[PDB]
Amino acid sequence: HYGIHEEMLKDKIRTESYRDFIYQNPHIFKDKVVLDVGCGTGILSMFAAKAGAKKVLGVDQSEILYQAMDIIRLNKLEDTITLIKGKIEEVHLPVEKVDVIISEWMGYFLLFESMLDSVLYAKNKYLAKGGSVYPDICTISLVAVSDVNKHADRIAFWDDVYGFKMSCMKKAVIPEAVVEVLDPKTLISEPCGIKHIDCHTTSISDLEFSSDFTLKITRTSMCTAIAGYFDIYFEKNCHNRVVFSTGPQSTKTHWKQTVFLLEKPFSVKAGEALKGKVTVHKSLTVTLTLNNSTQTYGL
Amino acid sequence: HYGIHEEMLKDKIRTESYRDFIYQNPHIFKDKVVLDVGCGTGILSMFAAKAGAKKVLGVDQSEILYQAMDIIRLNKLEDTITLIKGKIEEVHLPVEKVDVIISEWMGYFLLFESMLDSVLYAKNKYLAKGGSVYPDICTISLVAVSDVNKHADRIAFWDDVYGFKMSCMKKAVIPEAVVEVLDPKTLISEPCGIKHIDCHTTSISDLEFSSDFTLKITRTSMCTAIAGYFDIYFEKNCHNRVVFSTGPQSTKTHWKQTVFLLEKPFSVKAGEALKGKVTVHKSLTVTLTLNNSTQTYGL
Ligand SMILES: O=C(NCCC1=CCCCC1)Nc1ccc2nnsc2c1
Ligand SMILES: O=C(NCCC1=CCCCC1)Nc1ccc2nnsc2c1
Ligand SMILES: [Cl-]
Ligand SMILES: [Cl-]
């Protein structure tokens, strides 16, 4: 329980990105009313207070909120930061509107078990006209993978299990998306963006989407999986823009990467433009069409 | 879901120990009626069938049981192995008694989220007079740990989190037992057994227990945690006895080791006989007294 919060705090890419955004753009926070959606320990609320926020409201539905109360007091910030326990759609705030919303809401593959729905609710109910939401821009990308040894470990493995056939288990493991840090040497295409979200204009219905994609193959090889990741941007009104990626060419984060195993690996050639389609539906499911096969995956 | 079953199958120490016990002691199974409690994919049932079982009954409450049905058919064992979906305390078996019970029921620190309760129920309701249950003997042990760097990572960490005090979080993380493979070089005492279970005579009430223990300190150092693990024995009527340990001096298993962090590390000296007390209560909790401090931990 508390160990999870510890893990997110120790994710430097995640936490230092938010810290850098806030501290390097204090003009965004100076004398502003800030709402921190799903505040956890309160760390983002304290960053905002340090950057000069007039008032910060930290909301969380979990028992961690009681720790946050004690944390805020230990740091002598109780006159700036007010904490409220509950869902953002149910709680009563002591203001009508806020100037800025900040939140670390992101799930695996951006949208699995994410709090984006609550952030958008907060944006629609509470954001002042001309206010801002951060991080403001997110993208999701796909990339092709060749890893014949790992595929054999997950799939061919079932053909002989201590002397017994277990082939039918292949059908059970294929639909399970995997969250894992990938060796960047196993990537065999350029990444392809499949989704762009601006939190200022995105609605809840935009989170169910379809995209035709094209993977520019960079290595002649057997394609055994498709991997997904996301990038997070702090852009609007920033003098110091901040970006981080959760892809395999970047420093690992707790989001790792998301892997969709192909039931039937197929050969590709460098220079090939590999076309497919992806759809994300509400727990989320991901439907992939590639090489004339379709499979739906879940996390 | 299915990935978990895959992980348990790929745990060689676990799965090969059961395989070796059954295959190297086929006299235990020859022409016998066998009950496999929580059969998963059915692998233990198929081992027993291969060793010459007259009849095997595999029971599991999970959807994996449907995969097991298909697996048993792929291996042409349906005339020997019958699978039944449900809790052992609710299902109807096609026999009054069985000759042998086998089960992989073990949890972290032996007893967290274990199926031992169901195994003992099966033993009491269904085991023929003079029948046998395997594995038949289990022990739990404690060992002292020195790891000042890891302790600092978990505890002192909270004193300064990106410039802010979070000291109160120490109290939240201490009670959370950790499941992790330990570096055997960090062990600073001889192990001490705190519990011995023979499945033939153990009752459910025996699983809540207390033990005074003595740790024979082997290195002058700062003791920062107490670690727990368990050993599993296949003994009764065996010509080829089989043992495995889940301790840090042995090949890692999926059970890893269980770690109870000390809030206040304290110095110990080689040759010291360090005395403490441990009690396990029904989710399980573990109460430790050591160096005049008491703490209750959970998983
Ligand atoms: O499937 C995993 N990891 C899951 C590991 C696991 C091990 C034991 C049971 C539970 C799940 N990774 C993975 C990465 C890149 C790949 N490229 N082509 S196939 C493929 C696979
Ligand atoms: O506490 C862990 N592992 C938990 C790692 C974690 C990291 C980030 C948040 C979630 C939990 N191990 C550990 C082993 C031996 C030890 N000996 N003295 S203290 C101590 C500690
Ligand atoms: Cl290849
Ligand atoms: Cl030391």
Side-chain angles (χ1 to χ4, degrees), chain A residues 2-3 5-62 64-72 74-86 88-112 114-124 126-128 130-184 186-203 205-215 217-281 284-299, chain B residues 2-3 5-62 64-72 74-86 88-112 114-124 126-128 130-184 186-203 205-215 217-281 284-299:
Chain A
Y2 299 98
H5 291 273
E6 188 178 319
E7 188 193 354
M8 301 198 302
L9 285 169
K10 287 182 183 171
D11 181 343
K12 291 193 184 75
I13 296 297
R14 170 209 186 265
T15 310
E16 294 180 5
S17 291
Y18 275 82
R19 189 210 47 201
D20 291 350
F21 158 62
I22 296 165
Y23 284 7
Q24 291 170 14
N25 301 279
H27 62 285
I28 291 169
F29 297 87
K30 189 186 168 183
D31 299 320
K32 300 300 178 181
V33 182
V34 183
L35 174 59
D36 177 5
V37 181
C39 64
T41 61
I43 187 70
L44 300 191
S45 295
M46 300 194 288
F47 289 154
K50 245 84 247 264
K54 172 147 59 59
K55 186 57 61 186
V56 194
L57 307 168
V59 184
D60 201 301
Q61 51 191 300
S62 149
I64 196 65
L65 202 279
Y66 299 134
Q67 281 281 348
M69 287 171 156
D70 286 345
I71 291 170
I72 263 59
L74 277 176
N75 294 283
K76 309 192 185 303
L77 288 173
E78 66 274 22
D79 294 344
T80 306
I81 307 175
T82 301
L83 302 158
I84 304 168
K85 172 133 154 52
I88 190 64
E89 39 277 303
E90 293 169 3
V91 296
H92 172 63
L93 308 178
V95 295
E96 299 257 53
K97 297 293 184 194
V98 301
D99 300 308
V100 182
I101 292 165
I102 57 176
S103 179
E104 201 286 79
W105 51 265
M106 299 83 65
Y108 301 123
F109 192 56
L110 195 71
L111 304 169
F112 174 69
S114 93
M115 304 192 291
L116 186 50
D117 61 313
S118 294
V119 176
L120 299 174
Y121 181 93
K123 196 255 301 167
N124 294 326
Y126 298 113
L127 192 68
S132 305
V133 187
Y134 298 98
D136 51 317
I137 304 180
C138 307
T139 63
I140 305 170
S141 302
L142 295 180
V143 63
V145 179
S146 180
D147 203 326
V148 158
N149 293 342
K150 277 182 187 285
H151 192 277
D153 287 345
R154 302 301 321 291
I155 304 303
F157 167 82
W158 296 105
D159 291 322
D160 179 5
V161 180
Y162 297 96
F164 300 100
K165 302 182 166 54
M166 290 203 176
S167 291
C168 48
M169 288 286 289
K170 292 173 181 176
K171 301 299 190 178
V173 296
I174 283 295
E176 303 182 338
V178 163
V179 172
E180 175 169 287
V181 175
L182 298 169
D183 178 358
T186 64
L187 300 192
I188 58 152
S189 83
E190 307 196 14
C192 186
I194 60 166
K195 184 68 169 172
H196 178 277
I197 284 160
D198 189 307
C199 292
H200 296 94
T201 60
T202 300
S203 69
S205 70
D206 291 325
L207 311 188
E208 284 193 285
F209 71 90
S210 283
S211 185
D212 291 295
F213 61 86
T214 299
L215 300 167
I217 301 298
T218 57
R219 187 193 301 153
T220 299
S221 56
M222 186 67 42
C223 177
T224 59
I226 300 296
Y229 62 94
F230 63 89
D231 302 342
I232 299 296
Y233 298 76
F234 296 86
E235 173 175 308
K236 185 188 174 179
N237 286 332
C238 290
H239 291 289
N240 296 292
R241 293 176 171 184
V242 169
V243 180
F244 69 90
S245 181
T246 60
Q249 314 274 32
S250 304
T251 306
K252 66 184 192 186
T253 72
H254 80 278
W255 291 287
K256 311 179 173 156
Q257 290 91 51
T258 301
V259 193
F260 309 105
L261 281 74
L262 299 179
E263 191 172 348
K264 184 180 58 150
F266 63 96
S267 75
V268 293
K269 292 195 185 170
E272 182 183 332
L274 178 70
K275 300 194 176 295
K277 194 168 176 182
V278 62
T279 298
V280 172
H281 289 121
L284 283 186
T285 62
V286 176
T287 296
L288 276 171
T289 299
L290 193 69
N291 196 46
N292 293 309
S293 284
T294 299
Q295 176 70 51
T296 298
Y297 301 87
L299 195 53
Chain B
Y2 299 98
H5 291 273
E6 188 178 319
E7 188 193 354
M8 301 198 302
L9 285 169
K10 287 182 183 171
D11 181 343
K12 291 193 184 75
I13 296 297
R14 170 209 186 265
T15 310
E16 294 180 5
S17 291
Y18 275 82
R19 189 210 47 201
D20 291 350
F21 158 62
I22 296 165
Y23 284 7
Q24 291 170 14
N25 301 279
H27 62 285
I28 291 169
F29 297 87
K30 189 186 168 183
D31 299 320
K32 300 300 178 181
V33 182
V34 183
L35 174 59
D36 177 5
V37 181
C39 64
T41 61
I43 187 70
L44 300 191
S45 295
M46 300 194 288
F47 289 154
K50 245 84 247 264
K54 172 147 59 59
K55 186 57 61 186
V56 194
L57 307 168
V59 184
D60 201 301
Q61 51 191 300
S62 149
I64 196 65
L65 202 279
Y66 299 134
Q67 281 281 348
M69 287 171 156
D70 286 345
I71 291 170
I72 263 59
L74 277 176
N75 294 283
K76 309 192 185 303
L77 288 173
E78 66 274 22
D79 294 344
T80 306
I81 307 175
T82 301
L83 302 158
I84 304 168
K85 172 133 154 52
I88 190 64
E89 39 277 303
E90 293 169 3
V91 296
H92 172 63
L93 308 178
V95 295
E96 299 257 53
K97 297 293 184 194
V98 301
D99 300 308
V100 182
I101 292 165
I102 57 176
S103 179
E104 201 286 79
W105 51 265
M106 299 83 65
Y108 301 123
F109 192 56
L110 195 71
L111 304 169
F112 174 69
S114 93
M115 304 192 291
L116 186 50
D117 61 313
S118 294
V119 176
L120 299 174
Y121 181 93
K123 196 255 301 167
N124 294 326
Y126 298 113
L127 192 68
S132 305
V133 187
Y134 298 98
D136 51 317
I137 304 180
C138 307
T139 63
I140 305 170
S141 302
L142 295 180
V143 63
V145 179
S146 180
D147 203 326
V148 158
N149 293 342
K150 277 182 187 285
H151 192 277
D153 287 345
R154 302 301 321 291
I155 304 303
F157 167 82
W158 296 105
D159 291 322
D160 179 5
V161 180
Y162 297 96
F164 300 100
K165 302 182 166 54
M166 290 203 176
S167 291
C168 48
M169 288 286 289
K170 292 173 181 176
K171 301 299 190 178
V173 296
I174 283 295
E176 303 182 338
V178 163
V179 172
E180 175 169 287
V181 175
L182 298 169
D183 178 358
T186 64
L187 300 192
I188 58 152
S189 83
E190 307 196 14
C192 186
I194 60 166
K195 184 68 169 172
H196 178 277
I197 284 160
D198 189 307
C199 292
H200 296 94
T201 60
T202 300
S203 69
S205 70
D206 291 325
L207 311 188
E208 284 193 285
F209 71 90
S210 283
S211 185
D212 291 295
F213 61 86
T214 299
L215 300 167
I217 301 298
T218 57
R219 187 193 301 153
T220 299
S221 56
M222 186 67 42
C223 177
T224 59
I226 300 296
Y229 62 94
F230 63 89
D231 302 342
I232 299 296
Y233 298 76
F234 296 86
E235 173 175 308
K236 185 188 174 179
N237 286 332
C238 290
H239 291 289
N240 296 292
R241 293 176 171 184
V242 169
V243 180
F244 69 90
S245 181
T246 60
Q249 314 274 32
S250 304
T251 306
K252 66 184 192 186
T253 72
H254 80 278
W255 291 287
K256 311 179 173 156
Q257 290 91 51
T258 301
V259 193
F260 309 105
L261 281 74
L262 299 179
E263 191 172 348
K264 184 180 58 150
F266 63 96
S267 75
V268 293
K269 292 195 185 170
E272 182 183 332
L274 178 70
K275 300 194 176 295
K277 194 168 176 182
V278 62
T279 298
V280 172
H281 289 121
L284 283 186
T285 62
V286 176
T287 296
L288 276 171
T289 299
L290 193 69
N291 196 46
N292 293 309
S293 284
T294 299
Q295 176 70 51
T296 298
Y297 301 87
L299 195 53

